[PDB]
Amino acid sequence: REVKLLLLGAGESGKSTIVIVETHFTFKDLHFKMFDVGGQRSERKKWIHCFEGVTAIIFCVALSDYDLVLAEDEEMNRMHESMKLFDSICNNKWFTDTSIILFLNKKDLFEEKIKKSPLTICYPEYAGSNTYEEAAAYIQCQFEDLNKRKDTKEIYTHFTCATDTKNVQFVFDAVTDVIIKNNLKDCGLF
Amino acid sequence: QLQESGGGLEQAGDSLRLSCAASGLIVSNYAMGWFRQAPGKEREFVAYINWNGGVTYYTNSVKGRFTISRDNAKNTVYLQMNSLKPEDTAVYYCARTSRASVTTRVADFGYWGQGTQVTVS
Amino acid sequence: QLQESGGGLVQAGGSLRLSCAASGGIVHISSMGWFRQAPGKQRELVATSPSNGDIRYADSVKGRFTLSRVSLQMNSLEPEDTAVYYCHSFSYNNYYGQGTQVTVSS
Amino acid sequence: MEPRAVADALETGEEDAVTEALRSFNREHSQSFTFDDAQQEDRKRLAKLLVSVLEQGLSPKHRVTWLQTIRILSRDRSCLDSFASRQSLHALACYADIAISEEPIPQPPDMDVLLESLKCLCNLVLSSPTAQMLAAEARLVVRLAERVGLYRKRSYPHEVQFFDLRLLFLLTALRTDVRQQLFQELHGVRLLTDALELTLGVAPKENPLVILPAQETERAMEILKVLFNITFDSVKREVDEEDAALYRYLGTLLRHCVMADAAGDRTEEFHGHTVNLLGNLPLKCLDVLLALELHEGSLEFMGVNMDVINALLAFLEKRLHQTHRLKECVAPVLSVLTECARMHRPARKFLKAQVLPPLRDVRTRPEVGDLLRNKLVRLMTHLDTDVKRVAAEFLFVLCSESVPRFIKYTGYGNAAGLLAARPEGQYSEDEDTDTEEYREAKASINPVTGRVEEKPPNPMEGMTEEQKEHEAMKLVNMFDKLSR
Amino acid sequence: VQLQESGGGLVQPGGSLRLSCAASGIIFRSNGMAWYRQAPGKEREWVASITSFGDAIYRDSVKGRFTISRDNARNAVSLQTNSLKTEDTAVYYCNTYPVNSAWGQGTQVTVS
């Protein structure tokens, strides 16, 4: 009945904002989540480490770094390079039936960085439109179909932004900013 | 489909127990409600019940003499009628509600069945 | 929904005919006109028929650009005004369409 | 008439000819979305002549005709850049008796110019930003507020009232400084609550649900829009005792109308506006919703009334089916429901006993079904950061704010709604819920919950260390700022 | 617009009293009345208020001890003061809660 979690994602997505060992929850269940530091523990016998009985992984990929290119001055973009990790996680036989959790950090930057083209270097083939509600859904559908075993395994896609800035929480104010706009848009033509 | 039982004709002042079981190979885990339909009159609302006996709401006519209960162990819901009056002589139906909220005097939800006739002296 | 027919291949004050077909089904259009878009500026008014008085020409060119039911006859042309032409007329709105271009030289 | 003919008549000046021409033109043409170009140049010159004769004192005869012609002109963008001069705006304001000349009291009730000038003001401010920034400097909000305050001592017609309310709504919605000016300097919330009580007075003391007429519903919706635009700022937590009293008063005024219905089909719009205004009220004021005198035949629960809570829950039910503008529809409902459920044990128990009770379902994913629980847990995986967070907080406060009781349904909802600070909520661990499911709680992997499908690991030790090459694949993304 | 109060004062700690307020010259069905408390100083406290309906709102300091009557169709408003403390001695005014019109005369309340 105890669950294991596996934190993934590059350093720019901010996985530390979500909070190589951490087993002291015990909130009626073990709930053991592991950190991720490459090349630390596995030097003792040259036998590396197992410690894999995980039943749910945690993935954190940012969407603002969509116009970046992790490959230093190369054709391979950054979003494709992040999708490579999803492909590797799905193709591995250690997670053929392990649930996948998707996090998209730093959405507030992407929401206003649509000033550039919607397909500059992420999905150059096609794009639904220039809005958030369509481009984000397209990215979500692509990350969904990137999963091989879409029948048995089902992924969980969740979007995240800043929790609290200097003045006002976003989830308590954006609703007002959209209600005012719709209320004024309903009027006119007198 | 739902089946009703425990009706018929009875003299005024007695007590009668209405039964409603789900024998149409359907589960019963939502809210339930009893409704009446007087001949030549529109279908009215008499009782609303939440599962596990959480909440209950009766119309302003039978607030005192009607009681309703539910036992999910047998997938049955009971409506106890005490001291019958010639005002509530009609066929009585039961239905399940897809809405989680309390809705009143509306037949929005289906799964009626057949209904049992209740008449008073 | 609207379409127009008529070409332009004259370089010295010729006579042309341009027709605009009433392809749409809506009635009570009450007006039909033509335009011209120079390759350096936007569209300009040519002539309209408001069907509620007299026909209105344009102060830009006062030539005998005869217009009737529509059909626009370009007399005393002087094609120093080569451009792309369009038809015009008008749940209430107005429509342009597409049109031909005139190549002028000499 | 023809625009060219009217424009040419505008140069002569015959009193018994140009006015008849304007009247015939207004009688003929009086509908929006006119021609494009055959009216562009000539009617642009006509509007220039009209704004020139308007910058001077126009003829007192047929003032309604002049204002009607200018109103019809103000419906095309080609003339909005011409009519949006400070002089023209001040002229249309003083014609509407809403200018800065506050010395002439509203003694002459000449409405024929008032309603037309208000229509022109609305037309200009709704589609001309320069007109907005001009009216914000001319300060038309003060005289409008004074007029709205003088509604009981002087009975104004429905059209003038509604149009000045619409003008105030447009002005407070588009210009930012007008919001603060009407909030602090004009006591906008008090005046608007007064106007709201004034509108909600058709056959007063209607004990059951009161039906609102068309005009009353329109003006109530407009003043509710104005209140929502004016209130959402600087009302987060800390307020004074008198401000809290006024806010509880407004909350009762809105409670007495949420359960009410309107004529026609504007019931849902009115209820949405009420919920939008509820969202702006301070948290500790929302307790005035659950507090109601338990009448006969009312929804009883925990010895207290629950008619308004059940009403807004059914409103959330009926509103969830608008999937397009879902971010503006159900999010305020969820916010107000959370804030009125966090503070009261009866509301908490009511929501826990009417939203997510049924646990003895056939063991399947909770993110499927027709229940409100299934719809909310489906919405938790939405692409809108404003709606998944509020639904997560709703299901959190419903589970008495307990993470082990939050994983009641899924293990990903916690991943969606964790680390969302702005915590002394009411903690309760008294009732325990066990059915035929919780005896099978040993066979329910927590994020997936109760799927009981088990598969073996497939490397078989032949290539586990070789399957680790995916570690070398993933390690390249760990280091962040510098290689070094 | 004419405001007039009646009844008040002459009581010991633990007594009741009905404070009435007659309002004339204005509409009564659409005006939410309120009661104000003028303490012997330089402050003016707010007692309670009611809407066009019987909906009442009491002050946290007078919760469970005061009640407001409406008496519709009868151009007046009442305010019951029961089980008053030694601090409830002040002058009391009545006025419309949304629109604060001109204050009237008021009645003195003494607890001693």
In a domain, D460, yes or no: no
Structure determination method: X-ray
Q: Do C45 and D33 touch (CB under 8 A)?
A: no
Q: What angle do CA E87, E90, E96 make, to 5 degrees?
A: 120
Report DSSP letters for D222-251, one per residue. HHHHHHHHHHSSS-SS---HHHHHHHHHHH
Please report the number of interchain residue pairs, chain B to chain D, with beta-carbon separation below 8 angstroms: 56
In a domain, A66, yes or no: yes
Tokens found for residue D292: 């109601």
Q: Which chains touch A (3 or more CB pairs under 8 A)?
A: D
> Cα(A94)–Cα(D467) distance, rounded to whole angstroms?
9
Indicate the angle between helix axes D345-352 and D307-319, nearest 10 degrees. 40
CB of D327 within 8 Å of a chain A CB? The answer is yes
Residue of C nearest to D37 (CA): C45
| Closest listed residue to residue E94, CA positions, set E81, E107, E84, E83 | E107
- Which CATH number fits the domain that encloses residue D322? 1.25.10.10
What is the bridge-based pairing of β-strands B31-37 and B90-97? antiparallel
Nearest CB partner across the interface for A184, out of D174, D445, D448: D174
CB E30 within 8 Å of CB D152: yes
CB D336 within 8 Å of CB B83: no
In a domain, A181, yes or no: no
Contacts of D250 (CB under 8 A, 6+ apart): D189, D193, D196, D227, D277, D281
Q: How many CB atoms are located within 10 Å of the residue D180 CB?
A: 16
> Cα(B38)–Cα(A72) distance, rounded to whole angstroms?
81
Contacts of D441 in chain A (CB under 8 A): 1
Question: DSSP alpha helices (H): ranges in D29-57?
Answer: 40-55
Place of tokens 């996680």: A89
Q: Which chains touch D (3 or more CB pairs under 8 A)?
A: A, B, C, E
CB D193 within 8 Å of CB D151: no
CB D215 within 8 Å of CB D162: yes
CA D354 from chain centre, in angstroms, equals 27
- Best residue of A158, A166, A178, A185 to probe chain D, by most D CBs closer than 10 Å: A158
| Closest listed residue to residue D375, CA positions, set D423, D435, D313 | D313
Indicate the angle between helix axes D188-199 and D241-258, nearest 10 degrees. 30
Q: What angle do CA C55, C56, C59 make, to 5 degrees?
A: 150
Q: How many CB atoms are located within 10 Å of the residue C95 CB?
A: 16
Residue of D nearest to B58 (CA): D297
What is the bridge-based pairing of β-strands A4-7 and A56-60? parallel
- Total of domains in chain D: 1
In a domain, A171, yes or no: no
E to B contact (≥3 Cβ pairs closer than 8 Å): no
- Which CATH number fits the domain that encloses residue A65? 3.40.50.300
CA distances from residue E45 to A118, B73, D242 in whole angstroms, order as listed: 60, 59, 9
Residue of D nearest to A135 (CA): D383
| Closest listed residue to residue B84, CA positions, set B19, B17, B21 | B17
- Total of domains in chain A: 1
| Closest listed residue to residue B45, CA positions, set B102, B113, B120 | B102
A69 in a known ligand binding site? no
> Cα(D257)–Cα(E57) distance, rounded to whole angstroms?
17
Report DSSP letters for D113-134, one per residue. HHHHHHHHHHHHHTT-HHHHHH
Residues forming a β-bridge with D261: D211
For D155, the enclosing helix (H) or strand (E) is: none
Tokens found for residue A187: 């009027």
> Cα(B93)–Cα(B33) distance, rounded to whole angstroms?
8
Contacts of E87 (CB under 8 A, 6+ apart): E111
SS3 category, C38? coil
| Closest listed residue to residue C87, CA positions, set C68, C72, C103, C74 | C72
> Cα(A65)–Cα(D50) distance, rounded to whole angstroms?
55
Domain boundaries, chain C: 1-106
Q: Do D5 and C53 touch (CB under 8 A)?
A: yes
Tokens found for residue A120: 């500059």
CA A161 from chain centre, in angstroms, equals 11
> Cα(A14)–Cα(A105) distance, rounded to whole angstroms?
7
Domain boundaries, chain B: 1-121
Residues forming a β-bridge with D467: none
> Cα(C89)–Cα(C33) distance, rounded to whole angstroms?
6
Tokens found for residue E5: 């109060």
Contacts of D189 (CB under 8 A, 6+ apart): D183, D227, D230, D231, D246, D250
| Amino acid letter, residue C51 | S
Q: Give the closest-approach CA distance of D338 to chain A in angstroms.
A: 13
> Cα(A52)–Cα(D474) distance, rounded to whole angstroms?
16
CB of C90 within 8 Å of a chain D CB? The answer is yes
| Closest listed residue to residue D194, CA positions, set E50, E30, E102 | E30
CB of D322 within 8 Å of a chain A CB? The answer is no
The dihedral through the CA atoms of E100, E103, E104, E108 has a sign that is: positive
SS3 category, E95? strand
Cα torsion A123, A129, A130, A135 to 10°: value is -50
Place of tokens 């012609």: D69
CB A92 within 8 Å of CB A8: no
Q: Give the closest-approach CA distance of E88 to chain D in angstroms.
A: 18
Taking every pair of Cα atoms in chain B, the longest distance, rounded to a whole number of angstroms, is 38
Please report the number of interchain residue pairs, chain C to chain D, with beta-carbon separation below 8 angstroms: 29
> Cα(D79)–Cα(D341) distance, rounded to whole angstroms?
53
Domain boundaries, chain E: 1-112
Q: Give the closest-approach CA distance of D101 to chain E in angstroms.
A: 24
CB of C33 within 8 Å of a chain D CB? The answer is yes
CA distances from residue D59 to A172, D19, D54, D92, D118 in whole angstroms, order as listed: 52, 10, 9, 14, 19
Place of tokens 């509306």: B106
CB A86 within 8 Å of CB A143: yes
> Cα(D190)–Cα(A146) distance, rounded to whole angstroms?
56
In a domain, D426, yes or no: no
| Amino acid letter, residue B45 | F
SS3 category, B99? coil
In D24-63, the residues whose Cβ lies within 8 Å of chain A are: 32
> Cα(D275)–Cα(D221) distance, rounded to whole angstroms?
12
Contacts of C37 in chain D (CB under 8 A): none
Place of tokens 């979003």: A79
> Cα(D369)–Cα(D430) distance, rounded to whole angstroms?
29
- E strand segments, E14-70: 17-24, 33-38, 45-50, 56-58, 66-69
Place of tokens 């009143």: B104
